[PDB]
Design a protein around this nucleic acid. Structure first.
Ligand SMILES: [Mg+2]
Ligand SMILES: [Mg+2]
Ligand SMILES: [Mg+2]
Ligand SMILES: [Mg+2]
Ligand SMILES: [Mg+2]
Ligand SMILES: [Mg+2]
Ligand SMILES: [Mg+2]
Ligand SMILES: [Mg+2]
Ligand SMILES: [Mg+2]
Ligand SMILES: [Mg+2]
Ligand SMILES: [Mg+2]
Ligand SMILES: [Mg+2]
Ligand SMILES: [Mg+2]
Ligand SMILES: [Mg+2]
Ligand SMILES: [Mg+2]
Ligand SMILES: [Mg+2]
Ligand SMILES: [Mg+2]
Ligand SMILES: [Mg+2]
Ligand SMILES: [Mg+2]
Ligand SMILES: [Mg+2]
Ligand SMILES: [Mg+2]
Ligand SMILES: [Mg+2]
Ligand SMILES: [Zn+2]
Lengths: 122, 112, 53, 206, 122
RNA sequence: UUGGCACCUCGAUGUCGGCUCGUCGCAUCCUGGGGCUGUAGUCGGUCCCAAGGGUUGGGCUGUUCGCCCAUUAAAGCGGCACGCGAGCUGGGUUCAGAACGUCGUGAGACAGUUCGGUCCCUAUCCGUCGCGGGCGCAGGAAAUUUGAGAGGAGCUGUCCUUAGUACGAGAGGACCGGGAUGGACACACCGCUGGUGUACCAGUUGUUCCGCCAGGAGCAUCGCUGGGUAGCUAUGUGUGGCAGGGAUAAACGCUGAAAGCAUCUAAGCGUGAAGCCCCCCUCAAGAUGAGAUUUCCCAUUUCUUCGGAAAGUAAGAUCCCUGAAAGAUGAUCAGGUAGAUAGGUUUGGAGUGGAAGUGUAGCGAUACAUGGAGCGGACAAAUACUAAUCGAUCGAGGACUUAACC
């Protein structure tokens, strides 16, 4: 597995941040090395989603950030990233056995030449 | 591996009972000295059990004449005539290395 | 620690024989009709070759 | 003097009839085919060229396909020669099964050692560290490059460099078990290489 | 696995209580000694009114170690502490009794006299 | 070595000992071969041949040296800027402080003592160790290779038996050969035993957060503690040195004249070392002397003064992409839908050790059940779900002479 120029806690923070962003926005632009780590971490969260159990919900809730995605309106209740992972995202991969992400190569970034990719669901 | 499992499967001892670390076992070890073959019992608490398949080993610890002695066997050795589980042990971990660092009265394993 | 002699022009030029860039690995598209890096999305079409994104 | 090519599958252990426990390398040698017999008249020395595991067509080229054709066999991943063998034994296109070896037979395993990459003199040449304390600023360094008088460093002043990935021959490994239906040799002890490594098993020169 | 400056409980009647290993015999640059190997050693603690006196230089056979020994059957034996027995020119003990368990490896290195006196031979 | 001389260096050749790394000589310490012996035997002595390998841990001394303890087959002597400080140390020496003894009226001095006392440098070139790119090698390719030449390896103990024999008055006690088993060193590898294992499992403290409870997360060295997979590893495991052949050294001879004898020598044979050359391991055709075998591609097009040039190609290779058994980077090797190359997924496995939720018992801390449960990086197999799409670039058409045969 990749050390991403970070300590163990920083890296675990970075993978939690990127994972949540990928679940919330369904498409993010990041570096190639970051995108090749995320695909593992996000496809495991989507698997827990599809599981759907309380146990599975609590495994995902131990990793996914507590970000409000949107506020829907029923008395307007906010929807958290974790609810969007079990209510919206996972069930749309119910008959797909793995491979919920795809990395498109975009090109190098002006400031540091970093190879940039779009990583997206489906 | 799968081929190494197929090759070693014949060497696996089916008689081997179900023990966990914490169980008091009595190992009936064959002692091959020249041509004569003698049986020597070794009764102690199973301290650890590691490895997969034909490579599985376990370690029995007894206090013999006031000195701790550990005895590691392969689980499937044919030099173990018989393995008797004397008492099941209520322990909370897989390796009882802590049984090395304290003497009597604080090493008596809880019996179920 | 330090250069004993200045490096000559010829010698400096020989050392730089290898300090150079390689041509980019790129080909023309079908849709765009323009150049692109293989295995990248073509931004002229705004997609991955002919496959729409 | 027999020989065969196989892949190192990995290590394990077996109990001898005696009862002793020995460590073993498992060597899978399916699909050995004699490809070419080299003679003193044609090539200048006696050898038999043996091809090992089958390779998908698209992974071979016409030069390869045209050389195995002569032996009426599919292309092969590895092709090695065996010298010091009886060319009368071995026909072009014949299988070479692991039954050429028995139990108790004594072989020499040749293969390439695992790659360590760029290593220093402590690991590569087993040199001594300098002191770690008492004010030392000399730990994992290679020691004096030599005396002053030559105004140069002698060859074979051992220094850091790429470490493994060398051909190695372990001599006098006992074959422990031969299993034809699985095309497997159990060699006592270990042979050079990573798992999946090509290992060349010939009868021991000694 | 006993080297020069290693201390060992003495497992016999011979006054000596603790020895300090001066030399591992049986080879030029031999660093380490295991069960059944002879060492030269000086007596550092001594029972008052014994056969062997403090600060005396004696030969001892190592009869159990924490490093223990590998049998050819695949089995091992380790002990909780390193003990030796003080012997003569001939492999015969100065003491009359041996205490604690002794390793079978003594029965292979021509130390039958000691195995005879051991209460338990493991 | 102690010296003599003052020839290089005072616009610096900047240091004794130790550490690290060795390499060379042989005037040989051990191991091998031999002659003599005050060689009965054992244990020795001495000289000749012999430099292949080997040749130690401590205490005291700053100490080289030495003395001592304990080993060893042995603990060799020298050289290399008293080898090695742009490699290290900084104890000694060698500075400013201070004190003692001593000398000096004194300032001070002493190569008497004592305590304290800044160790700079990013490697250009050659050199050394690794690793690539280029071209060459009379066509272009893909494999398999010969070995000119080079490197590596090269050590040795004890026990039993022969045999209480040979020898000897006894005391004692073999050669030669046979067997077993070690030490040091080397190579490989992780099945075993252990180590590590910062994206594995569990326990646990404080505090903050997730609205609260329950369950979790952050931070505190990875918070700490107990374990631990893959990998990498030694203290772990396997294996090696060997044997053998050829020619020799010293040496012992045979045959043998010069010199009717004798004579190992002049002609001519033989025996004879750990040494030399093979044997064993590795590199190796840039071996420009560019070698060999097998297989593949073929003799295209255009213009050109013949010379040759240009262009699309063949076999084949690459760019690019997925990677690891490979790796600093290149390289190498596995793959690119003619698909298991990676990820995911499913099923396992190691490892941890009994999840959550619910229920039961208990006043409660907790316990038990559901249930070897739940979790499970890197390991195994299956699976085309995701990404290895698409392209492009490079790459032959084979000179002359002669000879034998076409
Ligand atoms: Mg932290
Ligand atoms: Mg590697
Ligand atoms: Mg050291
Ligand atoms: Mg340091
Ligand atoms: Mg010179
Ligand atoms: Mg003058
Ligand atoms: Mg100058
Ligand atoms: Mg000489
Ligand atoms: Mg000293
Ligand atoms: Mg010097
Ligand atoms: Mg110095
Ligand atoms: Mg200098
Ligand atoms: Mg005065
Ligand atoms: Mg001083
Ligand atoms: Mg340079
Ligand atoms: Mg050369
Ligand atoms: Mg291991
Ligand atoms: Mg907390
Ligand atoms: Mg709470
Ligand atoms: Mg803070
Ligand atoms: Mg004569
Ligand atoms: Mg001869
Ligand atoms: Zn396009």
């Amino acid at each position: 597995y990749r050390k991403l120029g970070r300590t163990s806690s920083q890296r675990k923070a970075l993978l939690r941040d990127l994972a949540t962003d990928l679940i919330v926005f369904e498409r993010i632009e990041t570096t190639e090395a970051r995108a090749k780590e995320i695909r593992k971490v996000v496809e495991k969260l989507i698997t827990s989603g599809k599981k759907g159990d309380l146990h599975a919900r609590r495994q995902a809730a131990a990793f996914i950030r507590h970000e409000v995605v949107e506020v829907v309106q029923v008395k307007n209740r906010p929807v958290y990233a974790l609810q969007k992972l079990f209510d919206d995202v996972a069930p749309r991969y119910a008959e797909r056995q793995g491979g919920y992400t795809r990395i498109l190569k975009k090109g190098p970034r002006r400031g540091d030449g970093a190879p940039m990719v779009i990583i997206e669901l489906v | 591996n799968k081929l190494i499992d197929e090759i070693t499967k014949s060497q696996l001892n089916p008689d081997v009972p179900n023990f966990r670390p914490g169980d008091t076992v009595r190992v009936h070890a064959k002692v091959v000295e020249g041509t004569r073959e003698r049986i020597q019992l070794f009764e102690g608490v199973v301290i650890k059990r590691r490895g997969a398949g034909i490579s599985e080993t376990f370690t029995v610890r007894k206090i013999s004449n006031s000195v701790g002695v550990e005895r590691t066997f392969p689980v499937h050795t044919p030099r173990i005539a018989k393995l008797e589980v004397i008492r099941r042990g209520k322990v909370r971990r897989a390796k009882l290395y802590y049984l090395r660092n304290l003497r009597g009265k604080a090493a008596r394993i809880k019996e179920i | 620690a330090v250069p004993f002699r200045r490096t000559s022009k010829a010698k400096k030029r020989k050392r730089r024989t290898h300090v150079k860039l390689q041509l980019p690995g790129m080909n023309e598209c079908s849709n765009c009709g323009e150049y692109r890096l293989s295995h990248h999305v073509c931004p002229e079409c705004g997609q991955y070759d002919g496959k729409d994104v | 003097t027999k020989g065969i090519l196989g892949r190192k599958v990995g290590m394990t252990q077996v109990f001898t009839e005696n009862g002793e426990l020995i460590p073993v390398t498992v060597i899978e040698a399916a699909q050995n085919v004699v490809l070419q017999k080299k003679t003193v008249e044609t090539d200048g020395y006696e050898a038999v060229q043996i091809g090992f595991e089958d390779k998908r067509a698209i992974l071979s080229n016409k030069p390869e396909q045209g050389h195995v054709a002569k032996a009426n066999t599919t292309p092969k991943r590895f092709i090695r020669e065996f010298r010091d063998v009886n060319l009368d034994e071995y026909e072009i296109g014949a299988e070479v099964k692991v039954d050429v070896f028995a139990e108790g037979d004594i072989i020499d395993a040749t293969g390439v050692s695992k790659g360590k990459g760029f290593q220093g003199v402590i690991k590569r040449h087993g040199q001594s560290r300098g002191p770690m304390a008492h004010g030392s600023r000399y730990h994992r360094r290679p020691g004096s490059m030599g005396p002053v008088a030559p105004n140069r460093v002698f060859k074979n002043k051992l220094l850091p460099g790429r470490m493994g990935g060398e051909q190695i021959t372990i001599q006098n490994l006992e074959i422990v078990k031969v299993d034809v239906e699985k095309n497997v040799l159990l060699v006592k002890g270990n042979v050079p290489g990573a798992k999946k490594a090509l290992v060349q098993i010939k009868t021991a020169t000694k | 696995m006993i080297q020069q400056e290693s201390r060992m409980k003495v497992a016999d009647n011979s006054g000596a209580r603790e020895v300090l290993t001066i030399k591992v015999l049986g080879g030029s640059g031999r660093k380490t000694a295991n069960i059944g190997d002879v060492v030269v050693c000086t007596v550092k603690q001594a029972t008052p009114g014994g056969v062997v006196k403090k600060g005396e230089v004696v030969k001892a056979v190592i009869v159990r170690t924490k490093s223990g020994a590998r049998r050819q059957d695949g089995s091992y034996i380790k002990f909780d502490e390193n003990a030796c027995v003080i012997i003569r020119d001939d492999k015969s003990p100065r003491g009359t009794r041996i205490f604690g368990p002794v390793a079978r490896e003594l029965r292979e290195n021509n130390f039958m006299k000691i195995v005879s006196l051991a209460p338990e031979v493991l």
